[PDB]
Enzyme design. Structure first.
Site, short mmCIF file in Angstrom:
data_model
loop_
_atom_site.label_atom_id
_atom_site.label_comp_id
_atom_site.label_asym_id
_atom_site.label_seq_id
_atom_site.Cartn_x
_atom_site.Cartn_y
_atom_site.Cartn_z
N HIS A 1 -8.20 1.61 1.09
CA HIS A 1 -8.17 0.94 2.40
C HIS A 1 -8.96 1.74 3.41
CE1 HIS A 1 -5.49 -1.38 5.53
NE2 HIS A 1 -6.76 -1.31 5.90
N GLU B 1 0.79 -1.21 0.00
CA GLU B 1 0.00 0.00 0.00
C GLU B 1 0.82 1.26 0.00
OE1 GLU B 1 -2.99 -0.36 3.03
OE2 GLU B 1 -3.69 -2.14 1.96
#
Ligand SMILES: NC(=O)C1=CN([C@@H]2O[C@H](COP(=O)(O)OP(=O)(O)OC[C@H]3O[C@@H](n4cnc5c(N)ncnc54)[C@H](O)[C@@H]3O)[C@@H](O)[C@H]2O)C=CC1
Ligand SMILES: NC(=O)C1=CN([C@@H]2O[C@H](COP(=O)(O)OP(=O)(O)OC[C@H]3O[C@@H](n4cnc5c(N)ncnc54)[C@H](O)[C@@H]3O)[C@@H](O)[C@H]2O)C=CC1
Ligand SMILES: NC(=O)C1=CN([C@@H]2O[C@H](COP(=O)(O)OP(=O)(O)OC[C@H]3O[C@@H](n4cnc5c(N)ncnc54)[C@H](O)[C@@H]3O)[C@@H](O)[C@H]2O)C=CC1
Ligand SMILES: NC(=O)C1=CN([C@@H]2O[C@H](COP(=O)(O)OP(=O)(O)OC[C@H]3O[C@@H](n4cnc5c(N)ncnc54)[C@H](O)[C@@H]3O)[C@@H](O)[C@H]2O)C=CC1
Lengths: 404, 404, 404, 404
Positions: free
Chosen positions: B286, B263
């Site tokens: 997310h 990420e």
């Protein structure tokens, strides 16, 4: 002789229309998966008794003139703007549709959109596909706890309210007719007060002068700052430049629109809107209705409406025609369509009086200029076949049939 | 109490936490909307009794060890990988967090994604922002009547199942542990069956050797052709290239991914994915737990855990520390943290016996190499002050203090 | 409308009915709290356009035939055995009633009885009014977790099943017709199984050759030892001595009977039963429908049926009469009731044709030997008045009138 | 050695206590179906380790003195007034009960009674058993639509509220602690305003000065005329002469009372009340608690509370004793009960310090005059068996045990 009665189905109605039709004996069906040409249509409709079409076929006065054997028209859709009703009326042809088979499909769409809009998903997603990563929680909300204000509490408004309540929202509505709230819904007497309290406002109203630009600057400005407006009703009901500005000033935090003042005519055509400049707006091409289940609900209902007109003469809910319906209660029944003028009925009834034949039941309804009459008589075939001849000869007659 | 006890709060904890802190007397608070660099963190924490942080702040051995006055650590957040637990436990610092503080945010996000993914809505919306109109019904479905396959029927899987059910989906789950179904949910023994059957599969598994690539090409192909796969558990669970293939192959209709193997560090770093080329995929940075409602619960809960432990020494639910809690009855209360080795406790009690002070209650719990104890005794303030000083001297002592 | 149209209302109909009557213009109302003797009934009805009654008033051939101006009859009550239907239909008088107007009262009564019977409460209460204290748990049970056996899953059986379910009982039913269960209800094929299993059996069957003594000694012994039998359907359904034996034998724990083979005529006549000696039996003077809420719905509904039929001639739901209803569109409307024989209708229409008056709509339904018809025509008042007079003269005519 | 630990059970506790006990190894059980004599008790309890009794056995200081081997007392009931707690405390014996196992039983009783009271059943039934037939609907009501006012919103009040809502009532409550309403319940801030709006008022409160005659003339007079008061809480809470008058003046339409200021001591004793003169009052002999399911819930819970004190030393919820409980986390555990005075703990801990034995965990709670301490040590049997010897010898010790 049902097998000799032709049903032309274009634009690919749901397979359940076929099942519900072949269950009723009508087995002579020409089905197409797509919309016919300015011309193969006419060739195919010429000896069709029933045509079944969708939103894309133009059943125009030119085309209905083509059709020598046409009996009733079935629009496997909500709209009928694609049909010349006046044309069909004149020739004695009822037109049927499916105005409420789509309820669930539309409510469920409004729930998903308000779930993701409240979360800022549509913006996060557009940035994501553009390689930008935008985490935040600031201004993201769950729906449980929020106020939903439903404007127009009819078939869809009430299904939505129920759905929303399952998710833990406080449902509140505004309709012009006073209503009976389902579950915990709460009617609000003034629009402006629905707007002030609503985290999400969703339009579920019909099209007409009362609804032309119902949501305009003034009404949008009343909405709670930070709210979302969702419109899957009619394209005429919200003012798009006014919404655009309200989105620009961040007075709203987002919107979903499924219908527009001007919609492209086909998938091939181009779509343009000032809202396309907004990441935080869901824009859909009028698909609130577009599910296989609605396709199926619609298939079943409009085919059943054609089956019933064919079998027992009912025009209940016909869109262009006097509505008439009699309970099946006796062998032998006929119908007659005619110019609505003095003396026709008398002539009709005489055909039986003057020969000792007893009328069991009759229903006559009229239009500004036409009458539907369904009659039940205690006779036998030969007698009826004969009365039918005579009925047909009645000054003013447009058409008539021996249903059974 | 004492408006001298310094709380450092960083990465913009919910304001609820500050309201809780202030309602309990603690007003001495340094708040920051975001993270801090190494030097100003180190500067703000030199004299801080408590710290509150999120995921971007890394309390390392060296950091913690130069926090001279640090009493406890609250992770306003589900996870504690940012914090050196061991390193804190050796300095007798308990670390708290908020274990299951966003089951609902995630459930609700999953419900909104599957409503819109089932409708092909994400695509139509992409296309509409590009001028292209796409009005289909052909692969679109309502949620009612469909099967939801939940992998991992835990806090979140469970809570999703109820929402899905109250929406008319049929709920099936596959879990490595026999669970008792809520509502009409049904546990499926073979992961392969669930896949083949389900119309939507949503992953809710923990991160661990047994979940890595849990959904690779095999498992994806076992999915229903035209089905959908949603993942808002852990970046590590899905062969993302498998998934891109299955999408380009039209074997899945769409998907929604909240977490990825790698990420971005911050909202400035680029987001790259094979899935970004697919309009029919929802990508979210997310955010399954990034909701105000959640941040608020977390904020209440964790500032709570810290107040309870400043005030009465509780460590119920601490993550690096023996768990002990004592009902408040008899003014005064003290606590002591020591190496866990024979002799301490007796040493500790004797301080009280030998001067005839009565011990009202006491709770000791130990870990591996640390023990912890809270004591209630009946004595005026001075005796407590003084005895404390004795407790510091007990051999084995790490830290001790006087609560009230 | 016309404050001249006399309504006679007897046996204390709910005041709601008078509010409905007055809101529709009809103010000329003779109301009585109770029944009347032969002479004052006959006196009040000599000039009455409509009558409303309950179960204690008997409109016989002779009575009806001396009601000179009687237009219709409303039984504010489920049943119509008090009224001579045939005799009214020959004078062209429709009789209305309120078919299923207390399903809820009965369901709710059954639920309260089984809660207390299951608890042995009725006995303990008898005993306590006699100075005797009886504190047991030994045969007492909660309703949750128990099986309710419903015999007759109709309007009332069904509605009971839902209440029972929302209370945690398991619901099983036995019915002579395959029915679709609501909620988690389960149809049982063999009456014997239902009996053996059920903890409570409640009868909801109609009165007819197949129900007489439906529950005699055989069927009762098939009941669960210690179970309970409730009957609020029909006096004729239960061998009451069987039932007294089964109670004295402790084979049933208790029961509740609302209706008996022979019921007292009035609140002055003695009530006699074998069951009166049993403290563990609830005896109620046939009150399953005797609730204000029900009386109110009945009152609204039936004064409604009468207004609709005074005003627009509807006879939807009439009990002795052909059912016809016509949507109001075009001022004026008339109706005619005649012997059902060929020739009338043509005769009736011709009155309009031959003077060039257009007939807008018309509905004829017939029974056996009567036919009925409502017509809409476009004409000013005088023409209608006059034509009416002609319609009276048509051979076959029983009665006719002009509505608006 | 469990099989050598005796459990005496009198008054016939539910068979599930036996199952849950024989599941835990304790198989040496003397069960009686009824209450023992002023004397066979003492003979039987003499070498009993655990006695299990109900509301009728008097476990008096005389009898506890009889019991040389007694360890804990289990009251399979709500009350403990039949036990001398002070007696048991002094001898180191905890007493346990089942204060909340009855919830459902009481709510369900209140629903049935308010169903039938609202209907006037209790009066109709008493007249029926006396050969009088009393039909009327006037003043009979269904419950759907009515307001229920629940006073005291604890365990039972909340179950009732839920039940009532299933039946369609509007639930409203009044409690002294502010509460979180379940479903649609609504807290009312002033009692007097709960009373004015309530069709049915039901008391669900504890016994104490705040509740002595809470419902007195003044409060009864506030109730809505025509209402019903139901009291299955405590016998001290409503004023019986004041209710009697309010029933007499027809200001209330009925009542249910399950508990009285003075209750007969046994079924054999006579019960007298001024309310027995009222047909429209349900009078029950304190059976709101008396069901087989509560008997069963109670059986399971109080046997499990004795099993846990026996196996791991927990006194959580003990009625006469300091509450203490430690998580099972290590082989070897002991307990010690002593006079609460300075120096005992120190002596206790020394027994291990002075021999290198490490204390894993300890919980000590004290009473005005006694201490319970449970300790977990890392040792083996021999060592423990020995420490136990020594612990027993500690000045101030009352008793001690090696749990495992
Ligand atoms: N987005 C889509 O693909 C589709 C759109 N629809 C549309 O949704 C709309 C509502 O549909 P339904 O509820 O099924 O029909 P409906 O007739 O039940 O809804 C109409 C409701 O709007 C209320 N209303 C009418 N005028 C109003 C006004 N002036 N101000 C406030 N309230 C007003 C009415 O009282 C009524 O309750 C219709 O326009 C329908 O065509 C239906 C299916 C699909
Ligand atoms: N998207 C986001 O920002 C957030 C993600 N999550 C994640 O989602 C996941 C679910 O969280 P909870 O519901 O609290 O989990 P949980 O602890 O309640 O349940 C996980 C379940 O998965 C089952 N399980 C474990 N290994 C499995 C395996 N290999 N195959 C099948 N089942 C397995 C376990 O039996 C357990 O029941 C966690 O990883 C959590 O971190 C949680 C919050 C936010
Ligand atoms: N206690 C009272 O004051 C009142 C009594 N009732 C009576 O209770 C009864 C039930 O009424 P509704 O629910 O409206 O009835 P319903 O018409 O809705 O249903 C009766 C059901 O019984 C079934 N059935 C018929 N004969 C049967 C047989 N011999 N064995 C088993 N099942 C059989 C039928 O299939 C039907 O489904 C009726 O007799 C009604 O008059 C109704 C209102 C008030
Ligand atoms: N009738 C019977 O056979 C039995 C009676 N009960 C009794 O019912 C009563 C309530 O029982 P539970 O709800 O289980 O216990 P509970 O403790 O949950 O109920 C007490 C509730 O009363 C409220 N309250 C206390 N004092 C009040 C006052 N001054 N004014 C207004 N509200 C007040 C409290 O806030 C609390 O919510 C108890 O007295 C209990 O013994 C319980 C079982 C059987």
């Amino acid at each position: 002789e049902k097998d000799k009665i032709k049903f032309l189905l274009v634009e690919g109605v749901h397979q359940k229309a076929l099942e519900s039709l072949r269950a009723a004996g009508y087995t002579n069906i020409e089905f197409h998966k797509g919309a016919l040409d300015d011309e193969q249509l006419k060739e195919s409709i010429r000896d069709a008794h029933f045509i079944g079409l969708r939103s894309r076929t133009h059943l125009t006065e030119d085309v209905i003139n083509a059709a020598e054997k046409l009996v009733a028209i079935g629009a496997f859709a909500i709209g009928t703007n694609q049909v010349d009703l006046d044309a069909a009326a004149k020739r004695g042809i009822p037109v049927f549709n499916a105005p409420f088979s789509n309820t669930r499909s539309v409510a469920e769409l409004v729930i998903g959109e308000l779930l993701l809009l409240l979360r800022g998903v549509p913006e996060a997603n557009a940035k994501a596909h553009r390689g930008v990563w935008n985490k935040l929680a600031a201004g993201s909300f769950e729906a449980r706890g929020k106020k939903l204000g439903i404007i127009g509490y009819g078939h869809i408004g009430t299904q939505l309210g129920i759905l929303a309540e399952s998710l833990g929202m406080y449902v509140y509505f505004y309709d012009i007719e006073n209503k009976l709230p389902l579950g915990n819904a709460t009617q609000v007497q003034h629009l402006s007060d629905l707007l002030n309290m609503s985290d999400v406002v969703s339009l579920h109203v019909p099209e007409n002068p009362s609804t032309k630009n119902m949501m305009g600057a003034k009404e949008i400005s009343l909405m709670k700052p930070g709210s979302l407006l969702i419109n899957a009703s009619r394209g005429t009901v919200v003012d798009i430049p006014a919404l655009a500005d309200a989105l620009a000033s961040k007075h709203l935090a987002g919107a979903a629109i499924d219908v527009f003042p001007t919609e492209p005519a086909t998938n091939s055509d181009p779509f343009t809107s000032p809202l396309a400049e907004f990441d935080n707006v869901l824009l859909t091409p009028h698909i609130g209705g577009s599910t296989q289940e609605a396709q199926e609900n619609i298939g079943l209902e409009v085919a059943g409406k054609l089956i019933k007109y064919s079998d027992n003469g009912s025009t209940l809910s016909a869109v262009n025609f006097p509505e008439v319906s009699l309970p099946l209660h006796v062998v032998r029944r006929l119908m007659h369509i005619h110019e609505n003028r003095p003396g026709v009925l008398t002539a009709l009834n005489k055909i039986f009086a003057e020969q000792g034949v007893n009328i069991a039941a009759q229903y006559l309804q009229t239009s500004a200029q036409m009458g539907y009459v369904v009659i039940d008589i205690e006779a036998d075939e030969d007698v009826a076949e004969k009365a039918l001849q005579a009925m047909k000869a009645i000054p003013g007659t447009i058409r008539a049939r021996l249903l059974y």
